[PDB]
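Lecture 7, part 2: worked example. A protein chain together with flavin-adenine dinucleotide.
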Amino acid sequence: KTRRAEVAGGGFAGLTAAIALKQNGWDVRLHEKSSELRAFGAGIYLWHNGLRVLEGLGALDDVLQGSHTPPTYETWMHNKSVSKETFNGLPWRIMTRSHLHDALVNRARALGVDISVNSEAVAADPVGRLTLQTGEVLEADLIVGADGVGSKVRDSIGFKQDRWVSKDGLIRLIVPRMKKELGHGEWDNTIDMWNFWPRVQRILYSPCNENELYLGLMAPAADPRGSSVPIDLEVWVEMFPFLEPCLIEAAKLKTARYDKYETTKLDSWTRGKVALVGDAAHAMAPALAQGAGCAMVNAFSLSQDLEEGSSVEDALVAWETRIRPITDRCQALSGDYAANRSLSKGNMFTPAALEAARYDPLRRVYSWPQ
Ligand SMILES: Cc1cc2nc3c(=O)[nH]c(=O)nc-3n(C[C@H](O)[C@H](O)[C@H](O)COP(=O)(O)OP(=O)(O)OC[C@H]3O[C@@H](n4cnc5c(N)ncnc54)[C@H](O)[C@@H]3O)c2cc1C
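Predicted complex, written out as structure tokens:
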């Protein structure tokens, strides 16, 4: 009677699938390749779609405590404010990655999800097996590929994949807010601080709570000072002097990494009893801040479709058919924004840009109209 799920990946997609399945009475085992459960990338934004998934997972309270909704999302071009957007009340939130990841881990443990670390999936079979790097073959009614970019679960099966890689990247960090030292201004806002002159450098300034500030320092990979890690303090201060107190702190972080990204569009997300979720299926450009939101909605939604009385194989097909278009459209528009630098103009969180954000996975409708 008790159905079994094997999840490869302990990132936001895997943790979400795990919790949602466990809530529905699945016996779920999650496998994380790393030696501990950690999330990288410094900070993250969630919108109403993602926040609803957390509500659905019973992990919302722990996320909202200790994270921040700025009074406004502000854009600057060459230090001039060009927009302030509040999205007609659409909920949104900024936090560190560890904060979101910890809430999800605690919830999974509270539910009794079996979590293994040092446990790497190297292959999956559509008939319902997952092979680990040690050689162990696990049978289950449902295998979830939540193993991120470069997914072995996906590549062991072979999907037709459109791949693209960005040449340019950014350096993401958590630093103290330094609020007093920043002096006059609106330093609780999101501030997307664009510049093309004297050089292409941008900081997305993203308060996570009273103590922690998430910064994303973005410069071309061809720029040997701006792309440097640990950060080349002088070049960031010269273009963002009003952030010097925080940048001095960022310069102390010798763990900084300059990270680029890749995008992935697949011919399908399923094969038999194997479902691909998150980056493994649909890595997208960061411009709409929806990569994880989409992953969380999709993982959540996969549990919904598995409650319909159908075989797993048919429930998977139904799931992709139902939920995929919101992700495809989001991915597409985000890619276009990123290629065209569209957010530089401000006022670009249009109703179509906000489509994925407006989606409520709990009631399966679009809310917070614009
Ligand atoms: C610059 C940038 C900014 C972004 N900002 C946002 C944002 O603000 N808001 C947002 O919603 N999204 C954002 N994203 C997207 C977001 O980072 C990803 O979409 C999301 O983290 C992917 O979740 P995941 O669970 O699919 O994969 P991952 O987070 O990559 O996790 C996969 C996990 O699987 C593990 N793993 C890997 N291989 C194996 C294996 N073989 N076996 C077992 N485990 C394995 C990994 O160790 C990792 O723990 C951003 C992306 C970029 C590039």
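The first strand starts at residue 4 and ends at 8. DSSP finds twelve helices and 22 strands in the chain. Keep this in mind for problem set question 3.
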